[PDB]
Amino acid sequence: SVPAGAKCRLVETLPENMDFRSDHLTTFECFNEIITLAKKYIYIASFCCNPLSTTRGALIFDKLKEASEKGIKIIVLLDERGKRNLGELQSHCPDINFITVNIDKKNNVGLLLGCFWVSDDERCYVGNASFTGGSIHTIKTLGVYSDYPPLATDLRRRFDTFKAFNSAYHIKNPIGGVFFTDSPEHLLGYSRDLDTDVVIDKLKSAKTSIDIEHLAIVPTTRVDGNSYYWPDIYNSIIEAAINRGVKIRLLVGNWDKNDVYSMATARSLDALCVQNDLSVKVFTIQNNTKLLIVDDEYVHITSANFDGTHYQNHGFVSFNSIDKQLVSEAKKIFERDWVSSHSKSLKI
Amino acid sequence: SVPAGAKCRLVETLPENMDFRSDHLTTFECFNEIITLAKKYIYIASFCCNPLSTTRGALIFDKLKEASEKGIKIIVLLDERGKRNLGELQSHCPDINFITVNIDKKNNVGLLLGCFWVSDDERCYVGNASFTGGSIHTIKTLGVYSDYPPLATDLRRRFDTFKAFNSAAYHIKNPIGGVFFTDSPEHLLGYSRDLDTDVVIDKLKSAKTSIDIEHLAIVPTTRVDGNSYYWPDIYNSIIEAAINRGVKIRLLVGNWDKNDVYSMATARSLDALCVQNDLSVKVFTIQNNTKLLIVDDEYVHITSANFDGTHYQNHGFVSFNSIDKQLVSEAKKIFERDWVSSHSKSLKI
């Protein structure tokens, strides 16, 4: 009935100046095939829309413009704080519907990240490649493409939820081994599962290994001029390594900004690298990859970073899979990134 | 009916070589009053019994010996891992009943700390002054004495629980007399006792204004049984109160080193938090058993355990809690004295 894996295949943006190589569908090829095969609609949700930054991004934008001129209903969702180039986006393509959204009318902290495409209720992409020229060509990204109509329909319902904010156990036995998790809690409705609870549960259930490629694993972030302390994911990682002997490899971005918090977290992680089975490598390249692999049997790909600001306020959809083949493909991706020349051991 | 405060008064050990001063009942005077007024029994629970280390402790030991010679039933509970001077304790006083206890027969990690005296179901002491000459004379300690029979009877039931391990809500919100006990570990709670872990974390999370803590170490990682154990529950409650709710927090902890990478890293983290939040950390080098927590100047917590994972997951102890305004204000002045003491210096390095 339902195909194993839900017809999902991994998508990558591997910049030519970087040493990352693979035979997966590229982000450019993914967006191009979605626009080409489109018959009725194309829905896109991202924090900001800035495709003209690279030549490949402008080509995707022009192909999307062609679809709009040929009757395809195209709607692009972007957060209110990415409204800088809104006038230029609508001037270039008057037939595209650009909508700014504010998902947090109470606190004005939550931001739309979504980071997914969906079209014709048949095809969809989901990952961490925003609708920018950087995410298409020059920034390393990781996502998932699928042409399974039930999965794309799930993403279309997420688009309905996000579009409604215009400014103007199924987790144990998923369908096809693939399921979505959502954020924030006040947008879950009655049926959707909070990504925070799923991620923490998978980290606590880890028996062997935890592999994470994220931007920053820090317990403290700055919610626009104010500090917010949220160590839930940070503690789950640390307690797995120390209390349960789980082998943990963390591939995170470089820190500084004279941030006392990020530096303190760096010294704490470096202190853990000397006595526990916790290894941390750092990358300096621009990298949007948000990847989590547990016991080589569960994979989690999203657009949010494992911090309190994202998982308490921001709006995003996260990809989850327990399909062994898709997990093994993601495991090979992380193994490549771990020993890459752009990943260096944590320095004191 | 029930007296406010449950007839509780603070008890301190202030060594003469230290600058700490107060008008509270001393630990020596407290133990002396318990031994003198004893009519039937005196029950004592501590990790170890080493009273002969100082002259004042040996004097208390001889008074307890005299009580045993006068028909008083004396039982001293000590942990099995404090069995060093057991032979000398029984040679000095053949009429005292010394019992070694192992509260964790499964894992052999939990230790008996109790740190309380109870006698005649009428009088009791509870705090962090063990039955040693150091805790009586040379080591700074803080405890509570009460002669309210219902409170001492509650503490006697804890003694019954611990003695059984021989080697051979509503009542928390409006307590009786504003005083109640919390207990540890979870596998010894029974059906009616409240876990000290949950109460401490709840009080820390409910803090609206101030959090004052005088403990040995506030670290998320300890060495339980040859292995490192990560437990940041109390650590996170403190930090999130300061960062997310703007609570003014003063932490008075002991000095660290031992080339411990974990304790050193935690030191750098706390000092990193001191630069942008209302969190101040001072360090003491003196010998100090004080385990004190004060929340919003309306809740006081005195115990013998340290706020770490080893204690609050394994060890057996009874913790004193009170919301009585008078007793809390007295504990608040104690912390204010300790905070600006000459033996407490701001965190450097």
Numbering used by the authors:
A (entry chain A): 6 to 173, 193 to 372
B (entry chain B): 6 to 173, 192 to 372
Provide the authors' own sentences about this structure as they appear in the paper:
F13 is a phospholipase anchored to membranes via two palmitoylated cysteines located in a hydrophobic membrane-interacting region (MIR). Tecovirimat is an inhibitor of mature virus wrapping widely used to treat mpox patients infected with clade IIb strains. Tecovirimat binding to F13 blocks viral wrapping, but the structural mechanism is poorly understood.
For the structural studies, we produced a soluble variant of F13 (sF13) by removing the hydrophobic N-terminal tail (amino acids 2–5) and by introducing five mutations in the MIR. In both, sF13 featured a homodimer stabilized by two helices and a β-hairpin with an interface area of 939 Å2, formed by a network of hydrogen bonds involving residues Y253, N259, N267, Y285, S292 and N300. Here we report the structure of an F13 homodimer using X-ray crystallography, both alone (2.1 Å) and in complex with tecovirimat (2.6 Å). Structural analysis revealed a large cavity at F13’s dimerization interface, which is absent in PLD3 and PLD4 homodimers. We hypothesized that this cavity reduces the stability of the F13 dimer.
